[PDB]
Design a protein around this ligand. Structure first.
Ligand SMILES: NC(=O)c1ccc[n+]([C@@H]2O[C@H](COP(=O)([O-])OP(=O)(O)OC[C@H]3O[C@@H](n4cnc5c(N)ncnc54)[C@H](OP(=O)(O)O)[C@@H]3O)[C@@H](O)[C@H]2O)c1
Ligand SMILES: NC(=O)c1ccc[n+]([C@@H]2O[C@H](COP(=O)([O-])OP(=O)(O)OC[C@H]3O[C@@H](n4cnc5c(N)ncnc54)[C@H](OP(=O)(O)O)[C@@H]3O)[C@@H](O)[C@H]2O)c1
Ligand SMILES: NC(=O)c1ccc[n+]([C@@H]2O[C@H](COP(=O)([O-])OP(=O)(O)OC[C@H]3O[C@@H](n4cnc5c(N)ncnc54)[C@H](OP(=O)(O)O)[C@@H]3O)[C@@H](O)[C@H]2O)c1
Lengths: 556, 556, 556
């Protein structure tokens, strides 16, 4: 291999190459003469990492470490995943993508543009690894609420793929981050000279659709029909349209639509363990008719049907509010997606009145509208139903409809709170401590992706996401439930991911969805054999010896 | 690529590289300055080929051409497959393996020994290609009736794999010929200084079984559970034992046992189109209780059961003779394999008396006993039943129980003759011309392997071989049947193979055997897209161009 | 390295790779499981080699062996160089080039055409090895008296380069055979469909000259000014013109012009040890005014001047005959090259009269005119001077002006005979046995090239060829001289080459011609360290170990 094995981040072990490995690889002298363990390398990386002030500097450190030594990169991540998930992925990856071209030093991933239509097979051949299982493609049109970042959005798939491996166990060498650059509508990037992008307006219409059709066709031609393809950060229209288009053709799933739904429903089912009742006797108010809200409502209707509730009566438990009030009889703008959860009721001005009108047991806020949950709302909630459920899922801590402390005070410490952004612990009256859980999509897609890749699941129906939500809800301990924590601690997410994979494996084998033929009897060991570990592999050559009568050199 | 693309027989096009391809590959100057077509290269190879006298020289020419330019090699083969099948495979490959080490110049295939137990994964990693679909492993213990040739037997898988691609359409780059060298019992090779082998007696018992277990495990670990593994030229005991062992664990099949059966039953079903009756009203006498005879009898019993005949009454139509006479009540040596077709009858001395005793409609000779079919036998055959069936399947033309002319004379030109060795046309009384067909295993395994590889069929049950026999029997034209030709002409075998593949594909999709998930609606086009053609691929790089406003170099 | 180290003839050891080497190279399994010595491989090659009938088959065997295992190829050659020099080089290489495209299977060397002018640097980059010392370029215009063979002539440089390594010690990996294809005038090849060539008439004039200028410029740009460039088998006009053009610009030499001269003068100086006199008292008659004759005459004039003879009186000892008679006062066609050795004498009809007119002590026949040396001539020679010298140097044994037996009879066993073609021993009257030596160019260019490459000699003046002739003449033993053997036996040529190299090294260091700076004190050991040996190198990796306190893995 030689000098090339040190420029390969999947093979490069740095100073952890033993002397024997350096001699056998032809890289002796290229490494300093110290032989470290991954622990000492981790200590060096940590000492250099803590010496930064801004989170962008830490992100840059981690990304350079990923380009240098991937096993050490994932050792850093899995070292304390709860502290490195905010850096490698949201929210830090957002400000990273905002200033991508500024700090952009090494290109990561695969950039496929609209002007490449017809030649995507070759561009996929540009990628070094040819055994690819997962593909996180992104469009750049709607990133982390920052909006259209265009080709700057490459940090989002890359970052997300880290969570595939750090959180789940997906072998990072089988993961390919793609960015489909169809232009950008961000005028700030159309004039930015540092914009590493395409610098014209978005190509939309049939050209964009043909580009994505060919992308799916080419990805599955080169890597197989079992290649899991996750769509990430597409526009609402495009997100749902392409989800319904390639839902049943490829192993495609969209985590903004389905991972959000799965984690929200997991939180709701976990709160059911606190309320001590059935999902049937809950009525849900949504504070948005959005991409996340529709997904959460659809998976919630599915969870209600699974409990033995007809489709119409289950839908009649979901009330939504979209910038105008409750979605009602042909009100002013309801497209066919809001028509489904439309209630047959007089029109309501705002959320704060429809909470009183239809007293809900569980309110869910997905609008990125800060302060939408008033003191009035939470007070009347705790008055109507004992132990109400509040889900301020808005991603930016600023945009949260309600904070932990506000909800816990106004509900007199009697409301199950959960959020999308981390609110730390809350102490109140009479020493009631609450640890408001953080509904993180990382609870869903790592284990789901691990199970799909393990079993070669051909398609991801909504039932997989529902049983994933059920498994996540079962992951929470009784002790944690006593503290209002609706989700398992992220320090265990790896195990959680495993326990999801096995489960989504069983389902796929009982519904004839898996393609891995010799169906493993012990699916846990099967999935564990595929969980990528940051531990270093040995690069030494096995030198065995034949008996010294079959290996003798003939001198006749 | 450079100089390395001319030492790769799969990529090397010789002087057929265009000037543009040579400039783009970095090999300009390494090729003489003439630009040929594959036709002119074929003419050169043919002019050099016809200038040899012994068939071993032609075999050496073809094998060197395979090591040089594989697409030209298969162009030579598919140019006239009926004249190059005897050279690349039996019978010429037999005398080639007999004098292998003598003319041995370039090692072909993969040599895995008994002393490599535990390290077969690395030896499989030695093979350049990593996308392997077919694996023809051989043992060397029983080659072409020449007996134990040991490691000299590597010509048999290699040669056979050529028929996978020349006869069928299997991409030769996905084929791996293996030789399991466990030693040899041929004392002639234990002292031959030119023996490229292991030079001790055969390792047998549990060591050999563990070696083969690990071989199957390692082949399917590296290349997948869908890797078709054909066992070839094993000892009778080992052949049947390993066939029944890995029958349902891997995509294994043994062509000496199952391809022989399939082609013999195909001949019988084709002769049914001449006799104009059903298989039920036929009684079969076998002239051997052997590896081929048992297989033919089992597939024939299956074909009878398919026509609506119980298992016992179907078995009661098969009479066998093994060196002692008819297999009867506990006669002297009947192991459990001959017990199945044992008839409850008084013991018979020889075949020539049991033909008179049980007058058969169809006699099959598989004993390599020359002249076993006497004038007496064929005469009384043509007397008992009008239009009898004679199958002198013994492989060496010398060992044939009966010749074409003898059978056609004694049966007064009224007997369907078929043989395993080529007997050319026969003219007789009253201008009756007969073209005695040659039952060749190449009718079976190329199309079966093509369909298995196309559909990723997990296992090969006997029903695939039976429907293959049926398809082969349907391949024969009415005109050819008027001439006593029981098998389709080999000049069409490629198409025949295709028509088998599609068929063995349909079956595999209606019995949930195929693993290729997006089941093709048009299976013919699907299989045709995988049929390897000798035509040269273009090595030029596709150079497209973005619109001249997205590809402009920024000079700010 | 893997599978690629077995397709590289310089690295491929065949079955001589030990088990450890196969495991360390990643080629275990690709080789049969026998471990041979180069002796056993030599035995296999010899057993397969002796089973051919025509010399062309043996040439093809050796050339395939060269393409497979180069160290075994040169082991075969140096095994008995006297029996493989006729096969790899003249005369067999001539009939090989005549039927090149017929048996052409693997392209060898570098084909540079006239239509490549401007891009020869890239074509030189096509060659795998980048450390090239020797370059035998050929034109194809005059090959071995067969005439214009065009691009078929590639066997001549390749073959000749074998003699660089088998006879001398030149590392074959540093040798590059080139063919400059400027077309061909052979109408037989312009219509031959198997002609691997350019198929138009020769490009001549300034285009050809610019092509060769750029060839020299590009070869020395890529490989250095020290790259020895031997011109071989050019047309007489082109041969001499380009020799005088690039004589002092590059390390160029032409062996048809200068190697012929060196070996002929070596024979003459050796015969001086039999005549027991000085070169000054010899008068020489040449039977040709040709490319070889002019060179021999010029080097002979130089040898006479070295003995203390003025230029004019030395030239006045050379008499030549060219198809018209003695070259005399402005006779009919004398170009400026024949003007030099023109004698001021009445015109003579034929050679047989000018031998009587000017009675010579030494006659040299270079005209390819069979029988030019009559019984009359040799008789009057032995009558005029006691112990005369006859040099029937014509290359084809058919074209020899005189045979060994004829000369030895007519001279009553008193004439030093030497020829260019092998005449075996001669017994005569009174048991006088003579071993007529064969003046072979292989006595000259291997050792000269070895010394030039060793010392990096910048230019090859005629003095190097003269001292080479002197060393060759000193190589002959007194015992061999008693038998009329003028040249050392070829079984010692390797040592001879060494003894020439060292000598041509000393000269180059005492005339400031060598470029190897740290001038070796022991030049013999220096040249021996560069003599390529067919012995196999070890491919194992050296695995040393640091003290077990500097190599311990830090776990802090
Ligand atoms: N796991 C997680 O924690 C997670 C995951 C994903 C998203 N989220 C959060 O959830 C939110 C979902 O947004 P999205 O991008 O999926 O959907 P979106 O496309 O942003 O749609 C937002 C919806 O909210 C409605 N809305 C806007 N202003 C409102 C107001 N003042 N009162 C009531 N409703 C209002 C809008 O209705 P109109 O149709 O009238 O505009 C719109 O349909 C995001 O802001 C994100 O922060 C959390
Ligand atoms: N496609 C084809 O055309 C094709 C394919 C494969 C094979 N073949 C031919 O068919 C033959 C099958 O041989 P195999 O290797 O498969 O089986 P095998 O192991 O050679 O067994 C041969 C059987 O014939 C019996 N036998 C021996 N001598 C006999 C005699 N004088 N009279 C009657 N029976 C006798 C033996 O019975 P015991 O048990 O008493 O020894 C033995 O069981 C081969 O010789 C081959 O030439 C043709
Ligand atoms: N080491 C060796 O043993 C060695 C090496 C090289 C060559 N040779 C032999 O030496 C010969 C040299 O030929 P070359 O190619 O170097 O020169 P060339 O170009 O073949 O010239 C041959 C010369 O011989 C003259 N000639 C032709 N016919 C004649 C006749 N009937 N009587 C007298 N002279 C005649 C011609 O003179 P015009 O000018 O009047 O035509 C011509 O100049 C070759 O044939 C070759 O066989 C031997």
């Amino acid at each position: 291999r030689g000098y090339d094995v040190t420029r390969n981040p999947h093979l490069n072990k740095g100073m952890a190459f033993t002397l024997e490995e350096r001699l056998q690889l032809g890289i002796h002298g290229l490494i300093p003469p110290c032989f470290l363990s991954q622990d000492v390398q981790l200590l060096r990386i940590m000492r250099y990492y803590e010496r930064q002030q801004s989170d962008l500097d830490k992100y840059i450190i981690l990304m350079t470490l990923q380009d240098r030594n991937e096993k050490l990169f994932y050792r850093v991540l899995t070292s304390d995943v709860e502290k490195f998930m905010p850096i490698v992925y949201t929210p830090t990856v957002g400000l990273a993508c905002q200033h991508y071209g500024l700090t952009f030093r090494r290109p990561r991933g695969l950039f496929i543009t609209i002007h490449d239509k017809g030649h995507l097979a070759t561009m996929l051949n540009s990628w070094p690894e040819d055994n690819i299982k997962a593909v996180v493609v992104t469009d750049g049109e709607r990133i982390l609420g920052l909006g259209d970042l265009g080709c700057y959005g490459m940090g989002i798939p890359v970052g997300k793929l880290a969570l595939y491996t750090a959180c789940g166990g997906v072998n990072p060498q089988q993961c390919l981050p793609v960015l489909l650059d169809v232009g950008t509508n961000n005028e700030e990037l159309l004039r930015d000279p540092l914009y590493i992008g395409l610098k014209h307006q978005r190509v939309h219409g049939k050209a964009y659709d043909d580009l994505l059709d060919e992308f799916m066709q080419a990805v599955t031609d080169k890597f197989g029909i079992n290649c899991l393809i996750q769509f990430e950060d597409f526009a609402n229209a495009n997100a749902f349209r392409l989800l319904n288009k390639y839902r049943n053709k490829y192993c495609m799933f969209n985590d903004d639509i389905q991972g959000t739904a799965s984690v929200a429903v997991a939180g709701i089912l976990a709160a059911l363990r606190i309320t001590k009742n059935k999902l049937s006797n809950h009525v849900f108010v949504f504070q948005g008719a959005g991409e996340a809200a529709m997904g959460i409502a659809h998976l919630l209707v599915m969870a209600l049907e699974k409990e033995g509730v007809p489709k119409a009566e289950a839908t009649r438990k979901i009330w939504m509010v979209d910038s105008k009030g409750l979605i009602v009889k042909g009100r002013s703008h309801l497209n066919h997606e809001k028509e489904m959860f439309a209630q047959d009721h007089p029109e309501v001005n705002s959320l704060e009145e429809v909470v009183r009108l239809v007293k809900p047991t569980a309110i869910i806020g997905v609008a990125a509208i800060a302060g939408a949950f008033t003191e009035q709302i939470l007070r009347d909630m705790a008055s109507f139903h004992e132990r109400p459920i509040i889900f301020a899922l808005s991603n930016p801590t600023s945009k949260a409809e309600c904070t932990a402390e506000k909800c816990y005070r106004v509900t007199e410490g009697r409301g199950i709170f959960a959020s999308g952004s981390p609110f730390k612990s809350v102490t109140l009256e009479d020493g009631k401590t609450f640890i408001p859980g953080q509904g993180n999509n990382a609870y869903v897609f790592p284990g789901v992706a691990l199970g799909v890749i393990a079993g070669g699941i051909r398609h991801i129906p909504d039932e997989i996401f529902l049983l994933t939500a059920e498994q996540i809800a079962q992951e929470v301990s009784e002790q944690h439930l006593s503290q209002g924590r609706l989700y398992p601690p992220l320090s265990t997410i790896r195990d959680v991911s495993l326990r999801i994979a096995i489960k989504v494996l069983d389902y796929a084998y009982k519904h004839n969805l898996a393609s891995y033929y010799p169906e493993p009897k012990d699916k846990e060991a099967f999935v564990r054999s595929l969980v990528y570990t940051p531990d270093y592999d040995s690069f030494t050559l096995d030198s065995y010896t034949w008996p010294k009568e079959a290996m003798n050199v003939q001198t006749v």
